Amino acid sequence: KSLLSLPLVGSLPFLPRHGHMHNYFFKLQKKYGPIYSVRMGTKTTVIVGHHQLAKEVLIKKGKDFSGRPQMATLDIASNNRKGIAFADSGAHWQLHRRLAMATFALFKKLEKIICQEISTLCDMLATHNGQSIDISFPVFVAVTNVISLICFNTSYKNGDPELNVIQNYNEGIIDNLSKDSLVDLVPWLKIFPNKTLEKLKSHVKIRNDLLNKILENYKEKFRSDSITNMLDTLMQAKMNSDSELLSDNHILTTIGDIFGAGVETTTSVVKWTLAFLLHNPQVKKKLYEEIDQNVGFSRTPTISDRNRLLLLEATIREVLRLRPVAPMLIPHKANVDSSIGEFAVDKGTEVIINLWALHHNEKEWHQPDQFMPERFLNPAGTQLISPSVSYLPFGAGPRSCIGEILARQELFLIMAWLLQRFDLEVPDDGQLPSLEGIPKVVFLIDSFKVKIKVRQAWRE
Ligand code: HEM
Numbered sequence: 001k002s003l004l005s006l007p008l009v010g011s012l013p014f015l016p017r018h019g020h021m022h023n024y025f026f027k028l029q030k031k032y033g034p035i036y037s038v039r040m041g042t043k044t045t046v047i048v049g050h051h052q053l054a055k056e057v058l059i060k061k062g063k064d065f066s067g068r069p070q071m072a073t074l075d076i077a078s079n080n081r082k083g084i085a086f087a088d089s090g091a092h093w094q095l096h097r098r099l100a101m102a103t104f105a106l107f108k109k110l111e112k113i114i115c116q117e118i119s120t121l122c123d124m125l126a127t128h129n130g131q132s133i134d135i136s137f138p139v140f141v142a143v144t145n146v147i148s149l150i151c152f153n154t155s156y157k158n159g160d161p162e163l164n165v166i167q168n169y170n171e172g173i174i175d176n177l178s179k180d181s182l183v184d185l186v187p188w189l190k191i192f193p194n195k196t197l198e199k200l201k202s203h204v205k206i207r208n209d210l211l212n213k214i215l216e217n218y219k220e221k222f223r224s225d226s227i228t229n230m231l232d233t234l235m236q237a238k239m240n241s242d243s244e245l246l247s248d249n250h251i252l253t254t255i256g257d258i259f260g261a262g263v264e265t266t267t268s269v270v271k272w273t274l275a276f277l278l279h280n281p282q283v284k285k286k287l288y289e290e291i292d293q294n295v296g297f298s299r300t301p302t303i304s305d306r307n308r309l310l311l312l313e314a315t316i317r318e319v320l321r322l323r324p325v326a327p328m329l330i331p332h333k334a335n336v337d338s339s340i341g342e343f344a345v346d347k348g349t350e351v352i353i354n355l356w357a358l359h360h361n362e363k364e365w366h367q368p369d370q371f372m373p374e375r376f377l378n379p380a381g382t383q384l385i386s387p388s389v390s391y392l393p394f395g396a397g398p399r400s401c402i403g404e405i406l407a408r409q410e411l412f413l414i415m416a417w418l419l420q421r422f423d424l425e426v427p428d429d430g431q432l433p434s435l436e437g438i439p440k441v442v443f444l445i446d447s448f449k450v451k452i453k454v455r456q457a458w459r460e
């Protein structure tokens with residue numbers, strides 16, 4: 001079993017119509033195969049674009065590849081590799097990941113917290129009846145409150161200016177955080193603001209100052225006899241020790257990861273989903289029929305309705321396939337000498353899963369470039385199915401998403417409540433939203449407007 005050297009690609013030329021980096025590397029697989037590497041100075045990066053090899057990296061050898069590479073921008077955002085998402089493997093990451101996951105067991109109620117913020121969201125949108133608006137902000141408020149309650153048992157009231165403070169440093173960090181090491185090899189894709197690094201520090205300081213103020217004030221509120229939220233879980237763990245792993249700054253960075261991920265991922269997917277529905281009125285009408293028939297207008301949707309709003313479930317699965325939140329996940333790193341397929345991978349090598357490539361494998365999916373929720377239903381439309389093994393929207397293995405349950409609950413309920421109450425149409429001017437996307441740390445959609453109107457079937 002002597003392993004082979006990885007294919008090494010010496011240069012990455014400009015190629016027309018290749019779009020974003022994840023599609024560019026995907027298309028290069030036709031010439032170099034499903035796994036190949038590039039070198040920058042002393043650092044080697046391997047890109048993996050087939051599900052079998054990806055599952056080896058993520059699952060079968062998940063521990064070998066559970067590291068995270070060091071990057072200047074990621075260092076800034078994670079306060080030098082604290083927190084969860086950008087923390088290297090080891091004792092700090094394992095502890096804070098375990099505690100974050102333990103916190104979600106205290107909400108088994110999650111549906112109730114979410115529905116309360118969605119009702120406020122719908123009330124706010126109904127006030128704009130007849131207008132064409134960007135719904136980013138209202139949705140941002142609802143999911144921000146959900147995660148604030150999970151983290152602190154606090155919620156913001158409509159109009160609180162802190163919501164705008166958070167939205168603006170969120171946008172500022174995301175716009176200046178580059179997680180793609182290879183960008184310098186494909187300079188025509190390196191798109192960042194003028195003074196990127198200082199602007200990133202500027203916005204991160206704002207975030208760190210606000211969270212530290214919350215955490216410091218929370219020391220006065222914490223009691224060991226009531227552990228109901230994430231900061232409680234972290235503070236109790238410090239007391240009950242490990243104690244060096246739970247520094248104030250470690251706790252602050254972990255809270256920051258959850259606070260940011262809990263808002264920017266789900267808000268993005270909601271916007272993507274609505275955009276796809278504006279481009280596919282046929283699907284939208286079938287979603288209205290499904291909800292009117294299985295829920296009606298007597299009551300509001302609940303999580304139990306996931307068993308009967310099957311096309312809605314399929315639509316979300318299809319958005320997560322076609323515009324993945326993380327089309328190249330978060331970069332991995334080999335913690336030890338290891339292997340992928342028949343190839344040797346040295347300790348320290350950066351390993352990137354091209355999830356875009358998995359989600360557009362023409363041999364594992366039928367017409368992968370088009371929005372077809374029905375691929376996740378049987379022919380009758382009566383049961384959800386998994387048509388492909390090349391589908392990993394939340395990752396897998398040791399570094400898999402820890403917010404999946406929350407995300408799926410938020411996405412289902414938000415969409416269901418919105419479809420029950422509102423007609424969602426293209427604006428008066430013809431403008432449809434661009435589906436091209438903006439490949440930042442989250443795969444964002446260009447801002448767009450939607451004509452929203454209370455459905456008159458919802459008259460009473
Ligand atoms: C909304 C749809 C979401 C999708 C599709 C998604 C998917 C993903 C993916 C692909 C990764 C990277 C896996 C890897 O590096 O191998 C990830 C990591 C992560 N996600 Fe999500 N996520 C979503 C929402 C959320 C939410 C709502 C939260 C928290 C409330 C969250 C928290 C995290 C964290 C902390 C990590 C890093 C885990 C680690 O590095 O150990 N995500 N997620």
Ligand SMILES: C[C@]12CC[C@H](O)CC1=CC[C@@H]1[C@@H]2CC[C@]2(C)C(c3cccnc3)=CC[C@@H]12
Nearest residue numbers: 085169170173256257260261264265326441
């Ligand atoms: C930058 C941002 C969002 C902007 C915040 O102000 C800072 C921040 C903290 C954590 C990051 C998050 C973006 C999404 C990240 C990167 C994320 C993530 C990414 C994709 C899927 N699930 C989670 C995990 C940690 C999250």
